From a paper:
Citrullination, the loss of a positive charge on the arginine side chain to form citrulline, is catalyzed by peptidylarginine deiminase 4 (PAD4) of the PAD enzyme family. PAD4 is implicated in rheumatoid arthritis (RA), where citrullinated epitopes serve as important diagnostic and pathological factors. The active form of PAD4 is a homodimer, and dimerization greatly affects enzyme activity because monomeric mutants are less active. In this study, we identified GAGs as physiological allosteric coactivators of PAD4.
Residue numbers in the entry:
A (entry chain B): 5 to 54, 65 to 125, 136 to 157, 172 to 216, 224 to 339, 351 to 370, 400 to 515, 522 to 632, ...
B (entry chain A): 5 to 54, 65 to 125, 136 to 157, 172 to 216, 224 to 339, 351 to 370, 388 to 392, 396 to 515, ...
The structure:
Amino acid sequence: TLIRVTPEQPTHAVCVLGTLTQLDICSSAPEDCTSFSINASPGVVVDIAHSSTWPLDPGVEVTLTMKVASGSTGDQKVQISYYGPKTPPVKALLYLTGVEISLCADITRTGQRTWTWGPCGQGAILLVNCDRDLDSEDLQDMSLMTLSTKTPKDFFTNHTLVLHVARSEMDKVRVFQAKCSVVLGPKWPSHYLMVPGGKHNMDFYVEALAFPDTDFPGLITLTISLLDTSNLELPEAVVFQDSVVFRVAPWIMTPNTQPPQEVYACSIFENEDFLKSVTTLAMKAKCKLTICPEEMEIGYIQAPHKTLPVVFDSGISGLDSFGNLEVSPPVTVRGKEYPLGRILFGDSCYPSNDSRQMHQALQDFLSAQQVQAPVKLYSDWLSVGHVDEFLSFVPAPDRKGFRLLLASPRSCYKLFQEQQNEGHGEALLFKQQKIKNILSNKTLREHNSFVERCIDWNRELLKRELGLAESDIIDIPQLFKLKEFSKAEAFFPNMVNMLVLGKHLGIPKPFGPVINGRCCLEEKVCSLLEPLGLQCTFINDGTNVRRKPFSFKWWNMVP
Amino acid sequence: TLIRVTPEQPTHAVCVLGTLTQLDICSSAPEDCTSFSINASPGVVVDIAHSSTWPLDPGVEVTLTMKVASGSTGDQKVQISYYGPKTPPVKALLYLTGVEISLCADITRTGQRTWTWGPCGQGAILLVNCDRDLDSEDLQDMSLMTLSTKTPKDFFTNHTLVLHVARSEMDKVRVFQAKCSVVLGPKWPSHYLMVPGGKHNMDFYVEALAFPDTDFPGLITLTISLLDTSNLELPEAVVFQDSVVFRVAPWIMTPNTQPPQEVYACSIFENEDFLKSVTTLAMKAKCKLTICPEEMEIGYIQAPHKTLPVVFDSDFGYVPQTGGISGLDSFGNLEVSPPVTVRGKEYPLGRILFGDSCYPSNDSRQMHQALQDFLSAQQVQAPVKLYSDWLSVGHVDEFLSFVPAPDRKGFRLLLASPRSCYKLFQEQQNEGHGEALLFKQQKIKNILSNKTLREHNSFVERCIDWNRELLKRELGLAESDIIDIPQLFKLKEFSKAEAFFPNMVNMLVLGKHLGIPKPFGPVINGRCCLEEKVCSLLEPLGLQCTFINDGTNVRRKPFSFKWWNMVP
């Protein structure tokens, strides 16, 4: 700020430690003036920012700061002298006064005011309080704001400290003083602080109320202001202001390759056959299987002090379900490394009167969480319309680190022809049809060509939207047959959707052809999956799999 | 698209140029094959990624493309000679075919296929059809995209081409297929283009319907899809897809420092003397004064086709809340700074400044948020909030304004500073002639013997100092570029500030010629003292001032700096 002084009478000024208070000596100068000498207190930082006896430049900023907060009203005073050849120097007095006002927060991102990203960047992280709540848990889920002012005892008789936020971001932040006392929030964008003289520390804890959205660009700001108030008839004037940086935590979705922590079940009560295999699997996996004690997708928000998990659930189309919403492993797309995955979702290739796609609200919601940029897919030609019915990710403890199982009906034809060319071509599937009875259906060949053509489009679109390669995709046999409105469906029960319970998993049984008392599809999928290092269990086939939240924190990427 | 070859029979396909033709080699491989070979001419651009014994690698990439276009089916032949150790070499066949597909437009931000800002960006700007506006006339002002298809004639009997926009973007693009023409717009998301085979060129004219706003970042995309319908019962299969991207041109405001092209007037009063002075002043400025025969800001949406002037209001181009609004969000509040440099970020197109309070409060006033989010969507001009609620008018131009100056950085900011008025009054009374009458008439010694005025007046100087530091940090200004205009302020009910005598800074500027309202000040030596100072400080630089007893909107030239060359 600027203060201007009149030589005929003393006046009162205030400088805050840390800011360079500008002083102009020329505009309000005495009538005749050409040379200046500074004889000031040793404790005052009086610098010059733009002894060579430089003349009175129009704009010559003299920066002023003082360190030691006083005890009385304006102990320190400053005087200037101006020596010329016309008369002895004239005098000006300034009643200066030091104070210290500091607002420190989670500056190190370890646990400061306007939202900001950055792996090496300044800004605290806010956990979204989508629930309405003490003690340690409050100390550990809200960010830390600490207020420290060193002042003269009677200094705040004529001064005031005010704490405020911008009016566009007022709705989605809230701060408590330390039941909890509301300082700011959706209703109060500003407040005045009651700080007595000397030292008084009042601490604040910060929370949000919403996730990044379309109408929420990505700032929440804080600014501290100092008011000069010496006269009771004039409006309040400002002397000091600081404005700095903190950011909100988004929502996240969890893939099927993380080491699980807790898995669940449903209520169909076929568990005695269903949950027997999965229960023995969890005993093999040493995972804690609390079945459902008695559609729902599991994510987590994180801060430097907490990683509280959350769950979400849901003019309705068949492509809007979360089964059409599948998250890739930690990925790297064209240099942009998404350690939190790229959400993958299916819609049509061109819209028409009959095309289907997601609600734009949901796509924008996943877009606004710029940690996971979504990807458009093509799963409209399929009758149900989900991506999980033809794509899946399974853990890979070697090579690249994750395996994409993709349905491919053309390897099924290869195997069926191969085992028919071995003499025993009368294997019974499931009515029951021979291998010849299926290889002698020309309609199936054309249906298969059409379905594989639709598959390849999605395939290419994953290889470009996930940074994939030919070595990272493995094909599983699955024949397809069309239906009403010429929509595709699987021939035998789907084998690409399955329960990943670790490095060993559960796949539904094919109930297919029997080869010397064994199912050929089963031995093939085991010869294609197990050598990588997995173990597969086969069962007649509702399950939600909570996993360990990522070691990577969302604030360490550059979106 | 992926192409798969089965050893039982060869497969025919159409390979559109622009996609590296990928070949699948593992899913449908022969039962005894472990290696295979290729046969083609040296001129063929064959792309292989690991004769020569190429085995069945899990990640061997095979992409093929051609150096010509085919209007005749299978003008080139490519046999893939799989070779087996104990099996005679089986040969997968593929009669190559390429159609010439061209989606040509103004795609260097000059209206991956993406949009990037900067002087060397990619994209196409479209201008808003804010008018209520045959085929020969609109070809110059509109954006025309050229779709060139060179395909065999028999294609479009079992193939269809489809143009479309997303199911969120229809109401923001209208395309005309070169009166009434609905291709894809407010009601139609897609169009089945009836394209005769052979070689054919197609033109579309594109106009918007909305400016960048809160919900619209500004980018739109248009995609053409090439399908396949060989069978009449099964669904269509996509063969190729191409895309282009546009951005809506955003409205740009106009500062008070740009050369004039058309000055406008309003016959609110008779003001014959004012009118004669204005026409004399405009003839001195050599501008075409268009009197209206019986606020509104005249900007421009600059595009690489035309720079249509834009009328923004609360002819040219004309671009709401039910009620209960406050008067201080009017358009006199929004003033455009010249190009500046703020904390490193440099703004060639200006920094919009407006009226608000320094800290939000219950009695504080601020602009309607709609304009703030609007001009924020205009990422070209990042706004700045200032401390100008301490007046009862709340307009930033009531105490500061930018005048042209051929010296240094080309602009000078007049700030209404109380304290120079008192300084000059002190000097004039010190020299002796301190009893001249002002204007209700009051004396020079009387005001200098008024201390209440010195306190209201010093408080206003404190507010001016705060806003001065704000401009030094939010406009990157300096202390030497601020002329302290002598001007006194007073307070009224609710402690709001007002001008005492007519404000010399709320002046209608029409170039270098300052139409300053008359101060009606003390008379000494023949002239007015405030007039004396303003003539003794501006004239040594070269300005010319005329003092009228004061509704003049001035359309001005564009900055000639293309908006698509800067990074928000």
